[PDB]
Design an enzyme around this catalytic site. Structure first.
Site, PDB file in Angstrom:
ATOM      1  N   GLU A  11       0.799  -1.240   0.000  1.00  0.00           N
ATOM      2  CA  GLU A  11       0.000   0.000   0.000  1.00  0.00           C
ATOM      3  C   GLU A  11       0.827   1.284   0.000  1.00  0.00           C
ATOM      4  OE1 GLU A  11      -2.997   0.112  -0.818  1.00  0.00           O
ATOM      5  OE2 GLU A  11      -3.839  -1.805  -0.206  1.00  0.00           O
ATOM      6  N   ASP A  20      -5.762   6.348  -5.497  1.00  0.00           N
ATOM      7  CA  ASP A  20      -5.260   4.973  -5.504  1.00  0.00           C
ATOM      8  C   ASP A  20      -5.255   4.440  -6.939  1.00  0.00           C
ATOM      9  OD1 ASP A  20      -7.917   4.197  -6.163  1.00  0.00           O
ATOM     10  OD2 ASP A  20      -8.300   3.222  -4.239  1.00  0.00           O
TER      11      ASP A  20
END
Ligand code: JZ1
Length: 162
Positions: A11, A20
Site C-alpha cells: 500500500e 489509488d
C-alpha cells in the site's frame, strides 16, 4: 513479516491525499477516503476520520492509527462474513494474512466473485487455488501485488515479500 509489514509494502505510505490505483481519493497506508470524484468530499471524510481539520495532510502517527483501524476492520469483517469465515479459519496464519490483504484491497463485495477460489483454498488445493485466483480483474489490474498475495496463498510462506 506480518500483516502490517505486508500491507505496508503493498500500500505504501503517503501523508497527503492521493488517488489509488482505481483513481479514488486515499491517504496514509491505503486508507480509502471516498469513491467520490469530489476532492472536497474526500477532505471532509479525512477530517471526520482524524477528528481535526487536516486540509488534506496527516502525520505518520495518524496514518498508522488509521492503518491499525483498517486492518482490524478487515479481519473483523471476514469473521462476520458467513462465506469467508469458514475458509479463513481453515487456513494457517501466513495464508490468513493473504486473505486479510485481499479484503483490505478489494472489500467483501470485492471478493464475492471468488467463490471457486474460496472452495479450492478450503480444500487446500494450493496450486489450483493459485491458478483460479489469477483469473480475475484483481490480478489483471494489479498483477505485481496480486502475484505476491497469490504466492502467499500458494506456499504459506513469506517468500514473495523477501
Ligand atoms: C479468496 C481469498 C480469501 C480467503 C479467505 C477469506 C477471504 C479471502 O478474500
Amino acid at each position: 513479516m506480518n500483516i502490517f509489514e505486508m500491507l505496508r509494502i503493498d500500500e505504501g505510505l503517503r501523508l497527503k491525499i492521493y488517488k489509488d490505483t482505481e483513481g479514488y481519493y486515499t491517504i496514509g497506508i491505503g486508507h480509502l477516503l471516498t469513491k467520490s470524484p469530489d476532492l472536497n468530499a474526500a477532505k471532509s471524510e479525512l477530517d471526520k476520520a482524524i477528528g481535526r481539520n487536516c486540509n488534506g495532510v496527516i502525520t505518520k502517527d495518524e496514518a498508522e492509527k488509521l492503518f491499525n483501524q483498517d486492518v482490524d476492520a478487515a479481519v473483523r469483517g471476514i469473521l462476520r462474513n458467513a462465506k469467508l469465515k469458514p475458509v479463513y479459519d481453515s487456513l494457517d496464519a501466513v495464508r490468513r494474512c493473504a486473505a486479510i490483504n485481499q479484503v483490505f484491497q478489494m472489500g467483501e463485495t470485492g471478493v464475492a466473485g471468488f467463490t471457486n477460489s474460496l472452495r479450492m483454498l478450503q480444500q487446500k488445493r494450493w496450486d489450483e487455488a493459485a491458478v483460479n485466483l489469477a483469473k480475475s480483474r484483481w490480478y489483471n489490474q494489479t498483477p505485481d501485488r496480486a502475484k505476491r498475495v497469490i504466492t502467499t496463498f500458494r506456499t504459506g510462506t513469506w517468500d514473495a515479500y523477501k
